[PDB]
Amino acid sequence: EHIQKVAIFGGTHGNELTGVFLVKHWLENGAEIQRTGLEVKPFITNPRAVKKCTRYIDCDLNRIFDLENLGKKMSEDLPYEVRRAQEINHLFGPKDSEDSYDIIFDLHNTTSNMGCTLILEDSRNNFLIQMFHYIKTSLAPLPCYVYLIEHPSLKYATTRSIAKYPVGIEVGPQPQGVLRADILDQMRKMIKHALDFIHHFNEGKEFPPCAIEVYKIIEKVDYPRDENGEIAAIIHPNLQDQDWKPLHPGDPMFLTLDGKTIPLGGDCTVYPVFVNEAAYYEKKEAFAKTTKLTLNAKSIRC
Amino acid sequence: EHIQKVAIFGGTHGNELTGVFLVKHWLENGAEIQRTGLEVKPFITNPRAVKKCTRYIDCDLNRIFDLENLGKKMSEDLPYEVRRAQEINHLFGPKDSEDSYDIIFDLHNTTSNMGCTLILEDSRNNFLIQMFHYIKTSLAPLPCYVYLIEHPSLKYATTRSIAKYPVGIEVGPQPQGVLRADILDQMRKMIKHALDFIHHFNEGKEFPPCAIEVYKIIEKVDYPRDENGEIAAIIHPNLQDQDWKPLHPGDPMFLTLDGKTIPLGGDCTVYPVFVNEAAYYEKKEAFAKTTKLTLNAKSIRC
Ligand SMILES: [Zn+2]
Ligand SMILES: [Zn+2]
């Protein structure tokens, strides 16, 4: 097919505000993002987790947009976010369906020092790459990065995963529960400018094939825990606020409260991402180790 | 008068962690905090809120160490905090009584870029002013700004106020539930000078008269609201991260998504503190407006 329905989701993580704020307005006086040809839909996904201003109320709405969850049946009892992903399947989905959106945006914010981050789901996404390639470009001088989740497994449950062509937008760093006017713009640069690439492409303009060499999630790093339970050695003052950068074998990683360091394994370079992210602390996670692995595509016309 | 009982409270609020980690580490080895001729019991105040990375369970434990709560007898219906408060007032109390603990340091991290902050409740009171001075100088050459809560009423409700000499230790920026090697180091050093301090004083060190620059809250400034009540504007950009620095009448104080700027007002200089604190949306306030006033202490000697 072609294009059609477009969405901007804000509120999947209720206490990620610069990703959320804007939407509340684009329901109030949405004139701020509607163009002369293209069609974009702004929607707040987890209203209740927004109001409290809290990651979630029953379960991560961001890990339940798939069979596994979507498929479960009607019980006013069920965990709030479930029934929510379900219904969400009617407005912009269902997922894997046909009438369901092809361009939705799942806006977020992190605590790790990451700056502009576009998230790619499957690698074989010729288009998405032209875009993830046409965003990085339309961005300079302000830095932008592409994160890839290559599930060999081959299955996603994300909120944005209802659309033909999903796109994750994340901006760091913005403490959960806070709203920095700076982050409310450290990112406006692709949206209303993306709402563009999702129109202009139509004219059938073409660019040479594509190969964004991204950083791909390959293995999450654990927190060196003491004994009884509690931590032992935390993110070192050298890795801190160093996402997307190399971490060779000497590079410190974890610093113990008694003063010691704990360096990197192997001898191959990596660019840690999601360094010291608030959420995932209950997961005993310090960061995701990444190899700046490659991504070639193919040219595209409309 | 010679000091004997000294407790370092941490985990007071659940998001804040530098103290949960520090306290615990000492609870296993206070060598760094033990002093000759003193007793320093590190203690976690809100065990539970620490487990559900909440700011708490029922309500804040930094607002109930007063006669209304203190006048309640222990029970089931009695909510968690009210219950725990007592146990601390039992353990480190009863209150305003000499029967209780001498000095208590309670640690707190903030999302505002404010660095090393000492919190004093009442100014006129020569005892606890020299201490802060010794810290300002011993912790140098990094700001170690001091914040005041002058209550002409002459009253306080901080978990730390059980002590005959309450001392607040706040440090930012270190997101809620995300511990940074660095932040933990500033506080680590603040505590040193403070513990050691009591040590040479206890061992009769004489001290000459001194004075300290401080900031008094003079107007909790709020974020603009909406038609009904929603947050219209927000903290301004150029102000973000400028806690403690000078704010004149016509300088940017806020902003609105339609690019609009809202100015300060009044006819004098103010020093915004707690500029964009995560808990402030909840404790309401875009930032605290304060005056820099001088406190002059008399020379003390044990
Ligand atoms: Zn998120
Ligand atoms: Zn606190």
Residues A274 and B212: their CA atoms lie apart, in Å, by 41
Contact between B257 and B251 under an 8 Å Cβ cutoff? The reply is: no
The secondary structure of residue B24, as a DSSP letter, is H
Contact between A32 and A66 under an 8 Å Cβ cutoff? The reply is: no
Q: Are residues B134 and B279 in the same domain?
A: yes
Give me the domain span that covers residue B227. 222-269
Q: Are residues B184 and B226 in the same domain?
A: no
Half-sphere exposure of residue A291: CA atoms within 13 angstroms, side-chain side: 9
Residues A47 and A42: their CA atoms lie apart, in Å, by 13
Closest alpha carbon within chain B to A110:
B175
Distance from CA of B237 to the nearest CA of A (A): 6
Q: Which two tokens stand for residue A276?
A: 């010291």
Query: Which residues of chain A lie closer than 8 angstroms to B255, CB-CB?
Result: 181
CATH number at residue A231: 2.20.25.160
Residues B61 and B32: their CA atoms lie apart, in Å, by 27
Q: Which two tokens stand for residue A116?
A: 């502009």
What are the respective helix, strand and coil percentages of chain B, to the nearest 5?
Answer: 25, 25, 50
DSSP string, B207-276: ---EEEEEEEEEEEE---B-SSSSB-SEE-TTTTT-TTS-B-TTSEEEE-TTS-EEE--SSS-B--BSTT
Q: Are residues B81 and B230 in the same domain?
A: no
Helix locations, chain A, DSSP H: 17-25, 47-52, 67-70, 80-91, 126-139, 188-191, 194-200
Technique behind this structure? X-ray
CA distances from A236 to A233, A252, A275, B34 (A): 8, 6, 10, 26
* Resolution limit, Å: 2.8
Q: Are residues B162 and B35 in the same domain?
A: yes
Residues B302 and B291: their CA atoms lie apart, in Å, by 32
Q: Are residues B290 and B227 in the same domain?
A: no
Q: What is the dihedral of CA B17, B23, B25, B29, to 10 degrees?
A: 170
How many domains are there within chain B? 2
Q: Are residues B205 and B247 in the same domain?
A: no
Angle between the N-to-C axes of helices B181-202 and B127-139, in degrees from 0 to 180, rounded to the nearest 10: 130
Q: Are residues A71 and A173 in the same domain?
A: yes
Residues A239 and A236: their CA atoms lie apart, in Å, by 6
Q: Are residues B132 and B40 in the same domain?
A: yes
Residues B272 and B170: their CA atoms lie apart, in Å, by 16
Residues B106 and B43: their CA atoms lie apart, in Å, by 10
Query: Which residues of chain A lie closer than 8 angstroms to B111, CB-CB?
Result: 175, 177-178
CATH number at residue A61: 3.40.630.10
Residues B162 and A269: their CA atoms lie apart, in Å, by 53
User: Strand pairing of A261-262 and A254-256?
Assistant: antiparallel
Residues A246 and B288: their CA atoms lie apart, in Å, by 40
Residues tagged in the binding site annotation of A for N-acetyl-L-aspartate: 55, 62-63, 156, 160, 280
Q: Is B170 a catalytic residue?
A: yes
Q: State the Rg of chain A over Cα.
A: 20
Q: State the Rg of chain B over Cα.
A: 20
Judged by a CB distance cut-off of 8 A, whether residue A203 touches chain B is no
